[PDB]
Amino acid sequence: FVAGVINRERIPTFERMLWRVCRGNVFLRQAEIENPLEDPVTGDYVHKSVFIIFFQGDQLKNRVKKICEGFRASLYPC
Amino acid sequence: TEFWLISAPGEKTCQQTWEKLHAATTKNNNLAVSSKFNIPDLKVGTLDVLVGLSDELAKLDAFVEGVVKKVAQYMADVLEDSKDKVQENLLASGVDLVTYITRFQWDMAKYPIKQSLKNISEIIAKGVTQIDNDLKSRASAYNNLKGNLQNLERKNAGSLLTR
Amino acid sequence: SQSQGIQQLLQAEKRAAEKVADARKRKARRLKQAKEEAQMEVEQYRREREQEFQSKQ
Amino acid sequence: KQFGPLVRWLKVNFSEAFIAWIHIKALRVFVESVLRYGLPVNFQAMLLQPNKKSVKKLREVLHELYKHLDSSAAQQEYYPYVYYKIDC
Amino acid sequence: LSDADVQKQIKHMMAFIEQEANEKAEEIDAKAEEEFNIEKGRLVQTQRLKIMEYY
Numbered sequence: 001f002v003a004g005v006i007n008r009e010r011i012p013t014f015e016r017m018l019w020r021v022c023r024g025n026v027f028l029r030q031a032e033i034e035n036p037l038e039d040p041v042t043g044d045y046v047h048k049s050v051f052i053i054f055f056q057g058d059q060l061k062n063r064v065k066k067i068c069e070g071f072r073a074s075l076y077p078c
Numbered sequence: 079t080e081f082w083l084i085s086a087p088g089e090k091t092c093q094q095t096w097e098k099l100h101a102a103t104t105k106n107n108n109l110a111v112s113s114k115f116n117i118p119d120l121k122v123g124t125l126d127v128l129v130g131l132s133d134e135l136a137k138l139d140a141f142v143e144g145v146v147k148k149v150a151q152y153m154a155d156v157l158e159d160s161k162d163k164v165q166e167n168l169l170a171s172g173v174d175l176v177t178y179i180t181r182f183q184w185d186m187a188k189y190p191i192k193q194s195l196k197n198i199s200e201i202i203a204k205g206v207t208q209i210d211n212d213l214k215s216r217a218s219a220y221n222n223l224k225g226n227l228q229n230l231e232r233k234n235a236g237s238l239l240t241r
Numbered sequence: 242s243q244s245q246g247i248q249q250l251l252q253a254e255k256r257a258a259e260k261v262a263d264a265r266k267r268k269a270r271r272l273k274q275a276k277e278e279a280q281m282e283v284e285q286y287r288r289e290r291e292q293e294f295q296s297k298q
Numbered sequence: 299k300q301f302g303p304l305v306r307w308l309k310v311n312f313s314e315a316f317i318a319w320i321h322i323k324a325l326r327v328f329v330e331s332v333l334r335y336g337l338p339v340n341f342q343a344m345l346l347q348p349n350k351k352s353v354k355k356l357r358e359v360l361h362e363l364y365k366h367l368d369s370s371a372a373q374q375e376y377y378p379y380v381y382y383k384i385d386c
Numbered sequence: 387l388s389d390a391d392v393q394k395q396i397k398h399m400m401a402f403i404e405q406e407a408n409e410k411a412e413e414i415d416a417k418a419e420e421e422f423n424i425e426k427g428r429l430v431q432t433q434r435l436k437i438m439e440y441y
Contacts, residue, residue, distance in 0.1 A: 019371035023334060024395045025125065025402065027246040056403060057126030081384035082356075083323065085331040085343035086364055093342035096363065103363040106356055111347035115324055119339065124406040128333050135326040142319045143385075149312040158305035167386035168316040175386050178320065179345045185321050195329065202322050209315050216304055223300060242389045246396035253400045257407035264411040268418030275426040283433055290441050336398040337405065369391055 003031040004050030007042070007072035014071045015051060021063045026053045050075070079167065079176060111176075116183040118191035120198075131195050138199060142206045145213070152217050327380045334372070334380060343380070 006014070015028065032049040039046060052075065055061050068075045086093055094114070101107040122128045150168050153160045160166065170178035184191060188205060189198040235241060331341045348356055364378030372378065 016371055016376070019369075020375050022125070022129065023371045024336070024369065024391075024398050026399045027243065027250065027392070027396055029243060029247070056406075057124065057129070059126045059129040063129070079347065079386050081386065082346040082348065083327050083343075083380070083382040083384060084346060084360065085327055085341045085380035086378075087335045087367065088340045088342035089367075097342050097344050103359055105344065105346050105359060106349045106352045107359070110349050110352060110356065112344040115327075115343045115345065117324055117328055117343075120325075120328065121339075121409075122329060122332050122405075123409050125333075125402045128329055128402075131329050132326075132333060135322065135329065139319070139323050139326050142315065142322055146312065146315050146319050149308060149315055153305060153308055153312060156301070156305045156308070159309050168312050170317045170320060171313055175316075175320070175384065176347070178317070182320065182324070182345070184324060185317065188318060188321055195325070198325065199322075202318055206315060206318055209311050209318075212311060213308065216308060219300065220304055242392055246392060246399075249396055250399050250403070253403045257403055260407050260411050261414065264414045264418075267415060268421070271418055271422045272425065275422040276429070279426045279430050282430060283437075286434060286437065290437060294441065337401045369387055371387075 001031065002052065003033050003048075004052045005033070005048055005074040006050040007039070008047070008049055009072050011049070011051070014067070014073065017067055017071070018051075018053070018064060021067070022060060025060075026055060028053055079174075081175070081179065113179055113182070118184045118186070120191065120195065122195060127195065131199065134199060138203050138206075141203075145206055145210045148210070149213050152213060152220075156220070323382055323384075327382055331380045341380075345384075 018028075028051040030049060030051055033047065036045050036048045038044055050073070053064065055064070064075075086097060090096070096103050098104050098108060098112050105112045122131070146168060150160055150166070154162060160168070167175060169175075189201040193201070327343065328339075331343065332339060335341065346356065361378060368378060
């Protein structure tokens with residue numbers, strides 16, 4: 001399906017912050033990247049996995065936009 | 079007296095006893111005082127409105143808390159039913175918060191329970207804003223009289239060089 | 242169990258879509274009925290005015 | 299002359315302001331409880347008057363009471379319940 | 387987190403969406419009935435007066 005891209009250094013905390021702003025409201029979908037290649041920034045190959053959430057509300061889209069900007073993640077396209 | 083305002087899922091009616099009755103989970107083994115809030119049955123339309131409300135209420139809550147402090151400090155200067163050593167907490171409808179919380183309800187007098195959250199939050203906000211401005215006016219008038227009075231008392235005070 | 246949650250919420254969203262489309266449909270239906278009844282009253286008014294016309298003439 | 303009525307008015311308005319403080323935060327806790335748990339809206343909400351030096355035990359008891367029922371997802375940010383401090 | 391926790395989160399996701407949907411539809415039908423009467427009255431009065439003037 002779709003495998004989003006995150007750095008996943010501290011995803012346990014990304015997830016928690018996401019629940020702090022609203023806990024338990026939407027499903028977090030997980031995907032993983034097999035045999036990732038050199039990080040565009042880090043310059044190395046690390047495993048990557050991502051949790052992607054579709055929201056109906058605008059307030060949560062803006063919330064998680066700010067969160068993902070603060071978090072080490074690339075969740076830019078719809 | 080400080081209080082903690084806490085809410086549990088409340089899925090079971092046993093929660094009240096779980097919260098209050100059963101020592102293993104009751105607050106401080108049922109020694110601490112724990113009273114239920116009487117809150118009217120209100121609805122949240124959407125999640126987006128829920129979040130907006132969350133932020134707006136946090137802002138409004140801090141606003142009103144500040145106003146309460148401002149008016150209490152004003153009266154403290156007045157020294158009428160509050161002082162620095164005693165009567166720091168304000169009374170609710172003329173009784174203490176402990177009494178008020180004992181009989182706590184959401185007050186239809188401040189906002190109808192049939193109002194949407196937006197409208198309710200707005201009515202309260204308007205109320206407090208108005209209260210703050212009324213205080214600003216009365217406090218200005220009192221501080222003005224207080225200073226001018228002292229200035230006149232001082233004018234006829236002092237040593238023979240300046241009195 | 243992810244695919245089930247995905248399916249379930251999509252089902253909720255679908256029903257929601259059906260719900261609003263149908264509410265809008267009822268609105269449309271009521272508006273047409275409103276027009277039909279309005280015209281009926283107008284025609285009733287017409288007959289009345291025509292009769293008074295005939296009476297006066 | 300102004301003082302008399304001044305302070306009588308203020309005392310009344312401040313009580314009303316305090317009640318409003320109570321109402322508005324009860325709503326705050328209402329909507330947060332809804333946001334935290336979802337529907338229906340029947341939650342177990344308590345006003346706690348701590349005992350001296352009981353805050354440790356209080357945290358312990360409330361933690362065990364609710365933490366095991368919800369999730370690790372939820373202090374200043376993550377608390378098993380809705381919790382606001384009433385400064386009085 | 388557990389599968390049961392995931393199921394509870396899914397139920398919560400359903401629940402808010404359904405509530406929003408129910409409220410919006412209700413709002414829509416109430417206004418629809420209002421619009422029914424408003425448009426009806428406007429139309430009726432608009433043409434009734436013209437008929438009157440003719441008469």
